[PDB]
Design a protein around this ligand. Structure first.
Ligand SMILES: *C[C@@](*)(O)[C@H](CCCNC(N)=[NH2+])NC(=O)[C@@H]1CCCN1C(=O)[C@H](N)Cc1ccccc1
Ligand SMILES: *[C@@H]1O[C@H](CO)[C@@H](O)[C@H](O)[C@H]1NC(C)=O
Lengths: 11, 28, 257
């Protein structure tokens, strides 16, 4: 469903 | 905030949304 | 948002998205009230009956979006939370009284054409605008229809939705439901006889109920989507947290921290 967000945010 | 509630693309440019007048007309 | 329309770009620059780091999921809606603070409903953070009790580290806040699902590269800004503050007298036990909560970002967000805060009402705005019959707006990426086995169709929106609704009189609110209501709540929605539709729905909680001031051209945040019984039901209205009422709590957290 959700496009992948960058890894620095998904701490 | 001092600038709260003024939208850059609407208010700040004297532009209106597809539906805000209906808001104002209810105030009348 | 049941029966709304797509929002236009930058129409609600104060709309924030409460997103789960894992599993990736939209939790709720929020509002940008300043550059380091977001306002939302407590029940988005803490609801024992359903097992919710989130920490600062389990969420992200996305501001500046239009798409529900896409990563709006160069448009949105993703922020981490520094701390969460639930009203100490929030009652998840019975009626959701005092369903409000502040979040403090780790770092200040920079404003743009897509990110801009909303004002909070003062006594005078509050008394001038929160009156029956007056319309406010609600936005969110919440469901489009009340959940039901018999729904055939996408129940999800692909872009932020908008819906304007009229504020309703207490007595009509109070008589439409059996939940005990308090002065910290307000109900908005078309009455039976106006034969029209529109409503917030699951997944829209935390989103702002705003009204525009004729007196000054500013949009004020009047309520927080909080609860309802179904979505769009006949003879039913949705409830919103009365922000003005709770403004004192709000100022205090913001002034100590
Ligand atoms: C959490 C929010 O997304 C959601 C929005 C309410 C739906 N709105 C409209 N306008 N129809 N709120 C809820 O889901 C809340 C939190 C948990 C239960 N809940 C409800 O709204 C129940 N449907 C009703 C309720 C249960 C307990 C106490 C108060 C209300
Ligand atoms: C929620 O979690 C926090 C710590 O994560 C804990 O201190 C608190 O008691 C929990 N509350 C509820 C109501 O489950």
């Amino acid at each position: 469903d959700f496009e992948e967000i960058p890894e620095e945010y998904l701490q | 905030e001092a600038d709260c509630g003024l939208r850059p693309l609407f208010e700040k440019k004297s532009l209106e949304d597809k539906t805000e007048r209906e808001l104002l007309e209810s105030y009348i | 948002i049941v029966e709304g329309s797509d929002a236009e770009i930058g129409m609600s620059p104060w709309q924030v998205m409460l997103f789960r780091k894992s599993p990736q999921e939209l939790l709720c809606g929020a509002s940008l009230i300043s550059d380091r603070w977001v306002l939302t409903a407590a029940h988005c953070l803490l609801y024992p009956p359903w097992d919710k009790n989130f920490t600062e580290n389990d969420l992200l806040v996305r501001i500046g979006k239009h798409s529900r699902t896409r990563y709006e590269r160069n448009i949105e800004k993703i922020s981490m939370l520094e701390k969460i503050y639930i009203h100490p007298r929030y009652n998840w036990r019975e009626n959701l009284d005092r369903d409000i909560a502040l979040m403090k970002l780790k770092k200040p967000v920079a404003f743009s054409d897509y990110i801009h805060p909303v004002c909070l009402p003062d006594r005078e705005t509050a008394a001038s605008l929160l009156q029956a019959g007056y319309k406010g707006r609600v936005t969110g990426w919440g469901n489009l229809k009340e959940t039901w086995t018999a729904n055939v169709g996408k129940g999800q929106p692909s872009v932020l939705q908008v819906v304007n609704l009229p504020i309703v009189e207490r007595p009509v609110c109070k008589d439409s439901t059996r939940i005990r209501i308090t002065d910290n709540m307000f109900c908005a929605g078309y009455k039976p006889d106006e034969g029209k539709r529109g409503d917030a729905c699951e997944g829209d909680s935390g989103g702002p109920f705003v009204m525009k001031s004729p007196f000054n051209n500013r949009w004020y945040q009047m309520g927080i989507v909080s609860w309802g019984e179904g979505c769009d039901r006949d003879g039913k209205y949705g409830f919103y947290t009365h922000v003005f009422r709770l403004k004192k709590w709000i100022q205090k957290v913001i002034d100590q921290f």
